[PDB]
Amino acid sequence: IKEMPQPKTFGELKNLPLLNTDKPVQALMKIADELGEIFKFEAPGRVTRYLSSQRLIKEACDESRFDKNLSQALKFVRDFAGDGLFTSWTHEKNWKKAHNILLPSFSQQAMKGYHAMMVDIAVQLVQKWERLNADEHIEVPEDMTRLTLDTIGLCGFNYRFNSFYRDQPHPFITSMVRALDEAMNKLQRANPDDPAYDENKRQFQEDIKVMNDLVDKIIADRKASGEQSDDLLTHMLNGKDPETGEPLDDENIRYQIITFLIAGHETTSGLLSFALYFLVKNPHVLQKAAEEAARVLVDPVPSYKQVKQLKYVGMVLNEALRLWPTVPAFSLYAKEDTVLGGEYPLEKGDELMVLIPQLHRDKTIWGDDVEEFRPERFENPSAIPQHAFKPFGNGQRACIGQQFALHEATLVLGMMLKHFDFEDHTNYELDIKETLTLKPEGFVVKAKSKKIPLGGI
Numbered sequence: 160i161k162e163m164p165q166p167k168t169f170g171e172l173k174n175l176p177l178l179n180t181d182k183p184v185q186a187l188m189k190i191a192d193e194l195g196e197i198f199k200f201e202a203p204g205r206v207t208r209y210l211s212s213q214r215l216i217k218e219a220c221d222e223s224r225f226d227k228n229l230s231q232a233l234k235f236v237r238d239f240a241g242d243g244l245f246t247s248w249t250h251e252k253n254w255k256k257a258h259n260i261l262l263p264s265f266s267q268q269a270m271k272g273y274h275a276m277m278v279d280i281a282v283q284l285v286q287k288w289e290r291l292n293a294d295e296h297i298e299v300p301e302d303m304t305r306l307t308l309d310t311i312g313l314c315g316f317n318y319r320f321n322s323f324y325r326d327q328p329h330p331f332i333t334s335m336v337r338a339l340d341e342a343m344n345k346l347q348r349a350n351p352d353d354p355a356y357d358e359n360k361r362q363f364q365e366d367i368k369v370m371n372d373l374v375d376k377i378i379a380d381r382k383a384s385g386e387q388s389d390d391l392l393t394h395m396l397n398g399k400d401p402e403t404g405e406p407l408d409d410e411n412i413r414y415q416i417i418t419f420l421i422a423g424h425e426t427t428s429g430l431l432s433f434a435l436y437f438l439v440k441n442p443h444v445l446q447k448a449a450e451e452a453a454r455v456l457v458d459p460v461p462s463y464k465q466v467k468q469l470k471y472v473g474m475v476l477n478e479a480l481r482l483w484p485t486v487p488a489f490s491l492y493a494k495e496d497t498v499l500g501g502e503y504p505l506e507k508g509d510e511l512m513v514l515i516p517q518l519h520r521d522k523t524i525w526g527d528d529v530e531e532f533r534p535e536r537f538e539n540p541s542a543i544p545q546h547a548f549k550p551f552g553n554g555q556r557a558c559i560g561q562q563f564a565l566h567e568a569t570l571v572l573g574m575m576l577k578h579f580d581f582e583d584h585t586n587y588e589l590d591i592k593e594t595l596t597l598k599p600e601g602f603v604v605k606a607k608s609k610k611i612p613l614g615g616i
């Protein structure tokens with residue numbers, strides 16, 4: 160047994176005020192650098208322990224001892240995501256039921272079926288950039304969000320957000336971002352119901368209505384449609400769980416739609432933005448990735464098999480996920496009393512937070528050069544020790560859309576690298592914006608076309 164390190168306190172508020180920053184994860188990473196593999200974080204009537212080492216996180220990932228917990232951030236997101244897959248407890252009937260009903264939507268057969276629609280949106284991104292004038296630059300995260308939101312909309316719901324037809328935000332995105340920002344900001348509130356937050360509450364309810372009005376539109380579009388679809392929404396509306404034999408009810412379907420539109424694009428936009436950022440900051444790595452894209456993507460538009468062949472692009476994405484996993488943490492609770500790492504006693508119900516970016520910087524696993532961007536670390540994924548690399552979470556509660564995200568991002572990054580040479584024209588200083596999720600803010604580049612014709616579709 161050992162005393163646990165803990166950061167600075169603010170009297171009766173304990174550690175709570177440390178979350179009074181617009182960059183909490185980054186603040187927690189700095190605390191982990193100072194305190195080590197584990198530290199306690201107290202708030203009035205609440206406590207959790209932040210883990211940063213693979214040695215302790217591998218134990219936390221033992222599902223016989225710990226189950227997914229809804230962190231305070233997820234409890235706030237649940238106000239609009241309900242018992243959708245991301246914010247449901249493992250023991251709630253609707254978690255396994257929806258998991259069984261929707262898993263087929265991420266099968267290899269399904270991925271092959273989404274490919275053409277991913278190409279449709281990727282072609283729109285490449286055409287936008289080909290059409291820019293000499294003077295112009297690209298707002299990277301903004302365009303990656305256009306791409307990822309449209310891709311989940313089309314592949315998952317046969318709905319076109321038509322984001323490339325807009326210069327300003329879709330009300331959905333504005334409301335989604337503001338809702339996630341509010342959840343993050345509520346983390347530091349000692350008195351959530353003080354009147355000074357009435358405006359925040361009013362705005363939060365307004366943003367939730369906007370998201371629900373969009374769900375209404377997607378559902379109306381499907382009912383009134385003639386096109387026969389067999390996508391995510393088809394399974395949500397018609398699929399039956401093999402175990403219970405039951406389909407989802409209307410309320411849960413609405414929560415899944417909101418969940419998938421948000422989880423199904425926000426983090427992929429972050430991944431693509433960080434990958435491009437690292438590529439322009441590491442010229443030799445960008446050269447290797449571009450060479451592979453040119454060599455592999457020999458047709459007017461990429462085939463599904465060709466995307467699977469973009470090995471180095473895939474390594475680039477994994478190395479971007481290592482340094483800046485866009486869902487930066489996940490939470491666990493102890494199923495029963497147990498001892499963590501042979502020295503930290505936990506009582507049944509105690510919470511743990513896995514700080515993924517810190518796990519990914521564990522020098523005892525990766526070597527000392529953890530801050531370097533080296534895709535080659537992922538040349539042979541099998542040599543990576545179990546539970547050392549966890550950008551998609553753990554076990555039965557791991558990311559259900561992992562393959563969708565990586566196929567979309569590999570396809571798009573491959574096409575980007577094939578069609579343009581990129582320039583960090585402002586020598587951009589990394590600024591990571593936090594809204595629970597992480598993404599570069601203000602990242603801009605110039606893309607000079609290689610003038611390679613694009614195929615139809």
Ligand code: HEM
Nearest residue numbers: 244245422423426427486489550551552556558559560564
């Ligand atoms: C590279 C982009 C992505 C990253 C880094 C990511 C990361 C994660 C992580 C860390 C979790 C576990 C959360 C926890 O334990 O609290 C998770 C869960 C989940 N993700 Fe992803 N994700 C990504 C893309 C996607 C996409 C594109 C979709 C939709 C197709 C998606 C849908 C989900 C859902 C529905 C869950 C909840 C699964 C369950 O518990 O049943 N994710 N993701």
Ligand SMILES: CCCCCCCCCCCCCCCC(=O)NCC(=O)O
Nearest residue numbers: 183230231232240245418421422488595
């Ligand atoms: C409905 C799908 C929603 C997808 C959004 C995913 C975001 C999940 C982010 C995980 C939490 C980020 C951590 C924020 C900082 C922190 O340590 N908070 C402590 C806490 O929330 O208890």
